[PDB]
Design a protein around this nucleic acid. Structure first.
Lengths: 227, 63, 98
RNA sequence: CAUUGGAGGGCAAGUCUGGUGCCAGCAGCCGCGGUAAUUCCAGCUCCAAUAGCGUAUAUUAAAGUUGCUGCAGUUAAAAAG
RNA sequence: CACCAGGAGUGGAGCCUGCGGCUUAAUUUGACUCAACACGGGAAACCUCACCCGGCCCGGACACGGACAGGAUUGACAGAUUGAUAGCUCUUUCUCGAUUCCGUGGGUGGUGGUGCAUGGCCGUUCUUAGUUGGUGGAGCGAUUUGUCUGGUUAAUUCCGAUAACGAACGAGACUCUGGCAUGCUAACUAGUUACGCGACCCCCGAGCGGUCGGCGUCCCCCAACUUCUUAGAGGGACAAGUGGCGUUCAGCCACCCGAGAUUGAGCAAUAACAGGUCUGUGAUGCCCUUAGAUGUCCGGGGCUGCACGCGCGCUACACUGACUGGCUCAGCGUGUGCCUACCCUACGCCGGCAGGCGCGGGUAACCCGUUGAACCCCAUUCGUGAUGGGGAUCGGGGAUUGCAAUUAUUCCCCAUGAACGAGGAAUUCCCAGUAAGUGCGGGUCAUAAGCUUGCGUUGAUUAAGUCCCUGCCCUUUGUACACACCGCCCG
């Protein structure tokens, strides 16, 4: 920022802005599906790529919204001109963007339609786009004064170890009701075996196998060839 | 905060000028005098010992 | 105060200069960011803009010491007719889907 | 202008609203009212016959819970020490 | 989260902390064994405050009717007034001016009530290896198998019983840290520099010569490399071999290759408790406060008052005490305006230290700092003497931040010289760079640690077994218990 500070507080400022903009975009622009963002900083540039299931929300009407919000936010936090930009993209492999399906679910549940028959739909859509295991849990009273919660599970869902955060793309959300709050959590395996966009590492944390092994079986006895 | 039952007077001072009050004298047409002075040296009036006006904090003493 | 004004009208030119606005929740803080040399140190945003939000011609949100103000399409005509300016809806945009 | 019993399941209709707050009442059985009451008191709405409806007490069937047809006696109440 | 084989301790004592107890303008609420008490960056004079006395401000929208041209309505030295140089509010006056208030509807906000209304959320059951459906199968239903003799492991991991088979999650896997790397990868912003004691230095010394020894002394840099050095990948370690055992099943003790498995830190389940979270929140439903506020700025007091009880606690009970003086020896990390007020250091001039002074290095392998770190070291002492100890209490001052330290908030001295002789009531902790001794960092800040949690050193007694005491899991197996022994229960 404008005080030319060390790399420590500079990287910290970068992360402060990532944080200070994430939930801003989530609680601002979620008149659609929502997937995520990705920032990076290069020489005399700083580029921010916004990723959601409506290019038009993040690309504005005739350049209006996205040339209106950007300059105020830019100069307000204190930046140069023409450095910060938001570049739109609609998630190609959508279907296991657990935040996206959880936000669609938040849509469909704040309207008043049933949680179990909607979570069956969440499961159906993620298994349409191809999955390996998921766990969706909701809390809140569906009648009266005594607490209740419900939970759906299927597939493989690793819990301990580090590969949870980057191999299931966990997602959490609230809903507000005239009767009160409900809590929602969706845990979905990442779809791609290879390292596609939301594809994790190529190998699977499991046994060995054969693609084309080699033997030494056929008789090979003394003769030659002269090339 | 205001733990007290009295907060004696949050009311603003009650102003009597909707009802009749002194602004200018009256006289035969063409010559009219001042009840409290309103000329640029609004009420330029000797409050107690000074000339002063409500909001602009106008400046003079005795005119 | 509400009715007295010498530093309250700048918000409408701000809202037609760009339609998305940032604000902070502090009046004890004479601090005002984003070009605060116009002699309105983050005041008078909370006086009459609230009762225009109540109309719904812009939008508001709280988070992280930063309140967000979203200009909407049906507000331009009246947010102008307060000044009788020309009906311009172009804050700065060069019509680039970016 | 035609009603008599209901509006929880059993047992044929409202996950009804203001109340009232285990308080009056309902509930032949369960339980319901212990402020977010489908059992109470009212408004609409719907259930059941219908000039009817139950109420209450004798009578029967269901009954193989009287075993004549045609019971059970280890444990269930049951076989003499 | 246990015993056994031992010690560091409490507990007894000086003193700081929070929990009850008495009170108080209220001494603020939370929590109440273990999973309430240096806990909520809770180390508070004042915002920080939710508490006890007194006041500004309405940002009470807006619609409707009121008041609206003698304008509805908003300012401000006076004499007052106060706790106050409050135009608060009167004496009074003066003008944004249709963007007020008065009644209805809005209750804005909120540290008002609930965690037992709920969410996200932690503790915690129990930390272990335990949680489901598929087919099939035994059961008329509940259920059951799938999940299991035994070898076998930190593992529900293997073999293996074979009505089970094909399946996962929880463990192993998923990472960091420390350790075998004399070979790999290069930094004039790092170091080195072995090389050119070259230039400065002493003759420093026997010698007072050739040279041997010591310069954090420099070379300007367009010399040079990563032994060491911060570390990328390359790559260790897998009961691997064999001496013994089993069934040589999955493995276990040992030794040569030495790093021999496993250095510890992490990561994170199913049912749920009604344990805690609305006083991390505008996470959040009811109702509540809505102009004499629980919203708001501020001043003083309170969260720190003492006849007791308790825990978390620093300092020891002195001779291995220890007093002054020397010199023998780092890495943790923050380090200049911030999301708005104060960033890491060093030099000499003074008073003794505290403390006054200004020049200067630094946005950090640049610079402090080759952190020229203590307690281990030693010279030194009087002499088993509440003793120069253990060292408060309080007296007398000095500075130092701050709007303001008065019930010492901190710092320093003269000086005050006390309660204490390893502590009976219960109990914890660790069997290895681990306890303990322990100086130093980092969080709070205008003030700042006996707390936190890391760096780090000098490093010990015995232990290699066992469930005998408190405790998980297993099997048999009785049960009127179905909120499960704190349960029903009986005269």
């Amino acid at each position: 920022m404008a005080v030319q500070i060390s790399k420590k507080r500079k990287f910290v400022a970068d992360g402060i802005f990532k944080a200070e903009l994430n939930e801003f975009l989530t609680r601002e622009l979620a008149e659609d599906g929502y997937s995520g963002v990705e920032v990076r900083v290069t020489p005399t540039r700083t580029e921010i790529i916004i990723l959601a299931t409506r290019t038009q929300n993040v690309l504005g009407e005739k350049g209006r919204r996205i040339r209106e919000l950007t300059a105020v936010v830019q100069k307000r936090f204190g930046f140069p001109e023409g450095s910060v930009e938001l570049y739109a993209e609609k998630v190609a492999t959508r279907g296991l963007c657990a935040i996206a399906q959880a936000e669609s679910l938040r849509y469909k549940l704040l309207g008043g339609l049933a949680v179990r028959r909607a979570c069956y739909g969440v499961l159906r859509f993620i298994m349409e786009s191809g999955a390996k295991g998921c766990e969706v849990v909701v809390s809140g009273k569906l009648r009266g004064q005594r607490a209740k919660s419900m939970k759906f599970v299927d597939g493989l869902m690793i819990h301990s170890g580090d590969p949870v955060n980057y191999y299931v793309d966990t997602a959490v959300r609230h809903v507000l009701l005239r009767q009160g709050v409900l809590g929602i959590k969706v845990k979905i395996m990442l779809p791609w075996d290879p390292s596609g966009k939301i594809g994790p590492k190529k190998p699977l944390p499991d046994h060995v196998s054969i693609v084309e092994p080699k033997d030494e079986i056929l008789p090979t006895t003394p003769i030659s060839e002269q090339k | 905060k205001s733990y007290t039952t009295p907060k004696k007077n949050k009311h603003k001072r009650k102003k009597v000028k909707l009802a009749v009050l002194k602004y200018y004298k009256v006289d035969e047409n063409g010559k009219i005098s001042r009840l409290r002075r309103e000329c640029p040296s609004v009420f330029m009036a000797s409050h107690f010992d000074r000339h002063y006006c409500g909001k602009c904090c106008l400046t003079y003493c005795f005119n | 105060m509400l009715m007295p004004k010498k530093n309250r009208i700048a918000i409408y030119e701000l809202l037609f200069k760009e339609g998305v606005m940032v604000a902070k929740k502090d009046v004890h803080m004479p601090k005002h960011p984003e070009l605060a040399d116009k002699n309105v140190p983050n005041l008078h945003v909370m006086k009459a803009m609230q009762s225009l939000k109540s109309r719904g011609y812009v939008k508001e949100q709280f988070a992280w010491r930063h309140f967000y103000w979203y200009l909407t399409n049906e507000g331009i005509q009246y947010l102008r007719d307060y000044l009788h300016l020309p009906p311009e809806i172009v804050p700065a945009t060069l019509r680039r889907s970016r």
